[PDB]
Amino acid sequence: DVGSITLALRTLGSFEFELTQFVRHCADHFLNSEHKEIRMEAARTCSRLLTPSVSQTAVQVVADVLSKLLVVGITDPDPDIRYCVLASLDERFDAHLAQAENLQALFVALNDQVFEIRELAICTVGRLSSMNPAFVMPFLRKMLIQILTELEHSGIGRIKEQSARMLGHLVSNAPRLIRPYMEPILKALILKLKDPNPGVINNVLATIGELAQVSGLEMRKWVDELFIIIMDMLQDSSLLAKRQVALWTLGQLVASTGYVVEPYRKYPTLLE
Amino acid sequence: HHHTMVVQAITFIFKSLGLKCVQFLPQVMPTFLNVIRVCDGAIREFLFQQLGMLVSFVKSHIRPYMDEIVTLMREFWVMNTSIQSTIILLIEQIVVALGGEFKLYLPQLIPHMLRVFMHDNSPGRIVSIKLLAAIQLFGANLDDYLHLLLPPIVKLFDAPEAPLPSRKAALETVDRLTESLDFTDYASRIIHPIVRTLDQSPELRSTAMDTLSSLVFQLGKKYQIFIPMVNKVLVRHRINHQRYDVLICRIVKGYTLADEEEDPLIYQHRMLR
Amino acid sequence: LNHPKTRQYVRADVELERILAPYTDFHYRHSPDTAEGQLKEDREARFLASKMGIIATFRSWAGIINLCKPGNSGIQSLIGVLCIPNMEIRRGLLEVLYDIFRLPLPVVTEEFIEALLSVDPGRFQDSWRLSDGFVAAEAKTILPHRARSRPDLMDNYLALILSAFIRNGLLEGLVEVITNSDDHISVRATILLGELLHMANTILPHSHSHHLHCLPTLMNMAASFDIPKEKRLRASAALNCLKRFHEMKKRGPKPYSLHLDHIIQKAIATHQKRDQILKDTEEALLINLRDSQVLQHKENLEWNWNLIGTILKWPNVNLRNYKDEQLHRFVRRLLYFYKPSSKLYANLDLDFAKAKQLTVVGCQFTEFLLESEEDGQGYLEDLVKDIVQWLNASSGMKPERSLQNNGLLTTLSQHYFLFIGTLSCHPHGVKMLEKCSVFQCLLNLCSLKNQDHLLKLTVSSLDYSRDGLARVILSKILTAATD
Amino acid sequence: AQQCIDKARDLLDAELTAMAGESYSRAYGAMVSCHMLSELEEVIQYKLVPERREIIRQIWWERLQGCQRIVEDWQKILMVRSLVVSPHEDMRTWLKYAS
Amino acid sequence: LGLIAKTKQGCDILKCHNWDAVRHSRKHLWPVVP
C-alpha cells in the first residue's frame, strides 16, 4: 500500500488532465497518516493542483484545504515537512492569503529554530507586506529592530551572518517599506565592513548592493567610502574569495548613483 | 601596601552612616576605580567583592559612576578562571540594587555571557547554573532581548551531553520567569524542543511537563491546534499530569468566552492588586 | 464669520484666536485688578473656560475653516507650543485633544498597563447592574451594530478633523512629547497615539493612510546608536506598548455578565450546527476523585473546584456505563450542596472572591446531569422542584410575609435561573422542564404585579430557538405586565 | 532581450581580450561597442518605470560627454539613445552633435 | 460628495478629480485591497 499510495499521489500531481472530489477526499490521509513520505507528497499535490483561483461555487473547498495544509505545515514535528510545505506557499495564492487567520498562523511560524524556514517565512511575509499593512507592520517593525540588535551586539559571527541574510531577503521582498529606514541600515553595515568566516562579508556585500538597487540617488553621501573599501578589497585581493558578487556590487552602485567618470582620475589605478 | 584595611574601613563607614553617605561618593569612587585599573594581584579579587558591598548601599545615586564600572568588568573578565563566581555575585547585587533602570546597561555585558554557555569547563557546569539563577531575577529588565538570550538557553537543554542538574536548572529558569514576561508568539521555538527532549530522560518527564503546563497558561485558545501532536507523546509512557489536564480540559471544552487569551502582564497586575 | 457683509466687520488675526490665549502664553494675566489671595485657582478657572471654548469652536465650519488658514494660523501655533518642555501645559493640551476626538480619558498613572485597562471599551458600566439597565443597555455597547452600508456621518467628520491635524505635523509633536517628558505624560501621549492610529486604518482612505503608519521619526530615533541611550530605550518600550495596544484592539470586547455570554454561546453553537477526546475510563478517574478532597468532609470552601470541573466536563465519564459508589457519594454531595434547601449555595452572598467560578461549576454540574439521563432521573427532579418551591416561597405562595426582596438581590439564588437556561436548550431538557410545574408556574408568576425584578431576571434566561410554551409566555409578558 | 544581451557580452569578450593585449587605443574600437551594448539595460529601465526618467536622462549626457569626439561614433550612440527619446525632448545633445 | 462616493463607478468618477475615498465595506474591520 505504501508504494501504491505514494506512486498514485505522485502521478496525480505529475501529469495533466481536465479531480475536484479527490482533494476533498485527501483529508483522510495526512491528518492521520504517520508515514512521512505520503503526507509530504499529498501536501505537494494538494498545494499544486488548485491553482485556478474564478467561479462563485468552489471557494469553500479551497478555503478548507488552505486551512488544513497551513495548520499541518505549522505543526508537524520533522522540519523537512515544514520547509517543503513552506516552499509551496509562494505568490501563486498571494491575493487570497490575506485572511486574518492565515496571517496570525504565519506570525506564529515566523520564529522557529531552524533557519531555512527563517528565510522562507520572512520572504513570504515581506511579499505579503504592501497589500495589508494593518496586521503585519507592527510585527515587522519589532523584527527590524531585533535584527539590528543582533547585528550590532552579537559577539558571534553566525548570528551576524544570519541577520545579514535576514536583511537581504527583507530588502528583496519589501520594495517601498524599507525606504524610510535606509540611513541606520547603511551606516551600521558600512561600519561593520571596516571592522578592525568571511561569509559575513559576502552577505553584507550582497545586501548592500540590494540596498543600492532599491535606493536611487539617496546614497550620494556614502559612495566615497564604499568605493575605497571595495577597490581595497579588489586591488591586492589577498584572497580569491567570492569576487564575482563583489564585482557585481561595485558595478551596481554606479548604474544607480549616476556616478560616471570621476573614478578613472580620482582612482587612477582603476582601469588597468 | 595597606589597602585592604583602608577599604574595609571605608565600607564600615558607609554602613555606619547609612542614607547620608551619598554626598561622599564623588570624591571617593573615581580614585577607587583608578586604583582598580592600576591595582594588581589576587587582592583584586577581594577588592571587587568589597565594591559589591558599596553598590549594595546607595541604591540609585551610583548611576553616573556605573558606566565606567562596566568596561572594567569587561576588561578583567577572564573566560575560564575562578574569578567568575565573584563577578556573578557582583551582577546579582547590581540587579538587586538598580531594579528597573538596569536595562540601560544590559547590552554591554551580553556577549561574554553568551560564550559562557559554550566555552566552560566547570565540573557539572556549576557556573552556568549560577549565572542562570542570576538571570532569573531580571524580570522586566529583559523585555527586548529575549530573542537573543533565549536561543542559548533552549540550546543548553538541547544537548543530551550536559549534566542532568544543569538541564533541570534550565527548565526551572525558563519555567519561572514567564510570570513577568510576554511569551505568546514565541511558541514554536519551545513546543518542539520539549517534545524532542520529553522521552530522553525518564526523570526529566515531570519537570518538563509542568514547565510546558505553566507556559501554556500565557497562551490562550491559540494552543488548540497543538493538542494531538503532544497528545500521542503524552500517553506513550502512560504518564498523566494534573494541571495540564485541567488546562486542556477548559480549553477544549467551553468554560467561558471572556476568559480567553489575555496578556500575561494584565493578569500579573490583577493578582498584584 | 459667514456672511460677506458680516465678514467685513471683523479683523483678521486678533479676535477669534484670542480664546486660545492661556495656552499660547506662559504667563497670561486676564485681569488687571485681581486679589492676591488666590492666583492659581484663577489659572484653573481660565484653563477650564478656554478648553471648553476651544472644543466649542472646532465644531462649527466657520471655526474649522478660519482656524486653519494657509497662513500662520493659530492651529499651527498650538501644535508648535506642544513641543516646549513645560510640565503642565503639555498636560493641559492632552485633555483638549481627547475630548475633541471624544475619547475616554485614562486615569493618571506612572505605569502603562494599568492605564491600558482603564480605557478598555469592555470596561464595566454602573448602569449595567440588575436594577438599572440589566441587559439591553449593555448589549447596546458590547455587540456591534447591524448596519452594513449606512453612512454614519460622524466618522466622516472625524476623518476630516483627523486629516486636518495630520496636515500640520501633529504626529511629530506627539513623538516629541512621548520621548522627552515625564512618565505621567508619556503614558497619556502614547495612548493617544495608539488610539489615533487605530482610527486611521479604520476610517481613513488608503492614500492618506498608506504612509502614516510607517512611523518615520520615532523609528529613526529608535535605531540611532549615537544619541543618549535613554531616548533609545524609552522609544523601544513605546513601540512595544503600541503593539500590545493594537493587539488588544484586535482582541475585541467581551461580555462581563453571564447572560449575554451564554446567549452568544448558544447562538454560535446553533449556527455552527447549521453548517457541517480522551476516554479515561476508571484509573485517572479514581486518581482525581480521590484527590478531589471532597469525600473527606462536607464543609465548603475546602475543595479543588477546578479539579471538580475537570471531572464534571471530562468527555467519556457519563455514569451510564460507569456505576461507581464514590461517584454516587460525590454527586450526592453536590446535589445536596446546590439545593436551595441546603441554605449554603443560596446563602453565599454576592461579591464573593470565588463566586463566578462557583456559578459556572454549578451550570457544569447541571449539564452533567442532563448528560446522564436514564439512571439519573431523580437527582434532577428533587432539585428542580426544590428550586420551584423556593421560587413560590419568595414570590408569595404563603400568607406570612410574602416579602423576601432582601433574599435574591444579595444572594446567588438569582443565578439558579441559569440552570433552567441550560435546561431550556436541549430537547430532552424541555421535556424535563415540563415534567414538573415550571412553565405553568412561570405563567402564574407573570400574573404578579408587585415584584418586578423577577421578570427582569426570568425574561433573560429562557431559550427561544425552538417553538414551544416559552414563546407564549414572552408574548403575554409583552402584552400583560406592568409599564 | 536579456538573454540576447548576455550572449552579445561574451561574443564581444572574445575579440576584446584578443584586442586588449597590445594597447588601449587598439581596444577603444571594441570598448565603444561594449559601452554601446551595456546602455540598453538603461533603455529597459527607461521604458519600464517612468520615475527614474530624469536621472537616467542626465546620466546619459554625463556619460557621453567623455568619449572621443568623432562624428561617426556619436552617430550610432545617439541613434540608439534616440530609440526612446524624441529629438525635440533633448535639444542640448543634438546641438553639440551638429556643432 | 462623500455621499455620491458610495458606489465603485462614482469613486471612479471622483478619482479623476483628485479626491480619495474608502474602497472597502464595514463587514470585516481588516480589509485587504486587491
UniProtKB/Swiss-Prot annotation, chain D:
Q: Which domain of life is it from?
A: Eukaryota
Q: What is the lineage of its organism?
A: Eukaryota, Metazoa, Chordata, Craniata, Vertebrata
- Tissue spec: Expressed in numerous tissues, with highest levels in testis.
* Designated name of the protein: Serine/threonine-protein kinase mTOR
Q: Where are the TPR repeats?
A: 16-55, 56-90
Q: Where in the cell is it found?
A: Lysosome membrane; Endoplasmic reticulum membrane; Golgi apparatus membrane; Cell membrane
Family membership noted in the UniProt record: Belongs to the PI3/PI4-kinase family.
Under the subunit heading, UniProt states: Part of the mechanistic target of rapamycin complex 1 (mTORC1) which contains MTOR, MLST8 and RPTOR. The mTORC1 complex is a 1 Md obligate dimer of two stoichiometric heterotetramers with overall dimensions of 290 A x 210 A x 135 A. It has a rhomboid shape and a central cavity, the dimeric interfaces are formed by interlocking interactions between the two MTOR and the two RPTOR subunits.
Q: How is it modified after translation?
A: Autophosphorylates when part of mTORC1 or mTORC2. Phosphorylation in the kinase domain modulates the interactions of MTOR with RPTOR and AKT1S1/PRAS40 and leads to increased intrinsic mTORC1 kinase activity.
Which disease is given in the protein's UniProt record? Smith-Kingsmore syndrome: An autosomal dominant syndrome characterized by intellectual disability, macrocephaly, seizures, umbilical hernia, and facial dysmorphic features.
Organism of this sequence: Homo sapiens (Human)
- What is said about the domains? The kinase domain (PI3K/PI4K) is intrinsically active but has a highly restricted catalytic center.
Q: What does this protein do?
A: Serine/threonine protein kinase which is a central regulator of cellular metabolism, growth and survival in response to hormones, growth factors, nutrients, energy and stress signals. MTOR directly or indirectly regulates the phosphorylation of at least 800 proteins. Functions as part of 2 structurally and functionally distinct signaling complexes mTORC1 and mTORC2 (mTOR complex 1 and 2).
Full-length numbering of the shown residues: 1560 to 1658 of 2549
Where, by residue number, does the polypeptide cross the bilayer? none
UniProtKB/Swiss-Prot annotation, chain E:
Lineage top rank: taxon = Eukaryota
Cellular location(s): Cell membrane; Endoplasmic reticulum membrane; Lysosome membrane
Describe its PTM? Answer: Phosphorylated by MTOR; when part of mTORC2. Ubiquitinated by the SCF(FBXW7) complex, leading to its degradation by the proteasome. Deubiquitinated by USP9X; deubiquitination stabilizes RICTOR and enhances its binding to MTOR, thus promoting mTORC2 complex assembly.
Instruction: Give the record's family classification.
Output: Belongs to the RICTOR family.
Summary of subunit composition and partner proteins: Component of the mechanistic target of rapamycin complex 2 (mTORC2), consisting in two heterotretramers composed of MTOR, MLST8, RICTOR and MAPKAP1/SIN1. The mTORC2 core complex associates with PRR5/PROTOR1 and/or PRR5L/PROTOR2. Contrary to mTORC1, mTORC2 does not bind to and is not sensitive to FKBP12-rapamycin. Binds directly to MTOR and PRR5 within the TORC2 complex; interaction with MTOR is enhanced by deubiquitination of RICTOR by USP9X. Interaction with MAPKAP1 is not enhanced by RICTOR deubiquitination by USP9X. Interacts with CCDC28B. Interacts with NBN. Interacts with SIK3. (Microbial infection) Interacts with vaccinia virus protein F17; this interaction dysregulates MTOR.
Instruction: Please explain the role this protein plays, according to its UniProt record.
Output: Component of the mechanistic target of rapamycin complex 2 (mTORC2), which transduces signals from growth factors to pathways involved in proliferation, cytoskeletal organization, lipogenesis and anabolic output. In response to growth factors, mTORC2 phosphorylates and activates AGC protein kinase family members, including AKT (AKT1, AKT2 and AKT3), PKC (PRKCA, PRKCB and PRKCE) and SGK1. In contrast to mTORC1, mTORC2 is nutrient-insensitive. Within the mTORC2 complex, RICTOR probably acts as a molecular adapter. RICTOR is responsible for the FKBP12-rapamycin-insensitivity of mTORC2.
Protein's UniProt name: Rapamycin-insensitive companion of mTOR
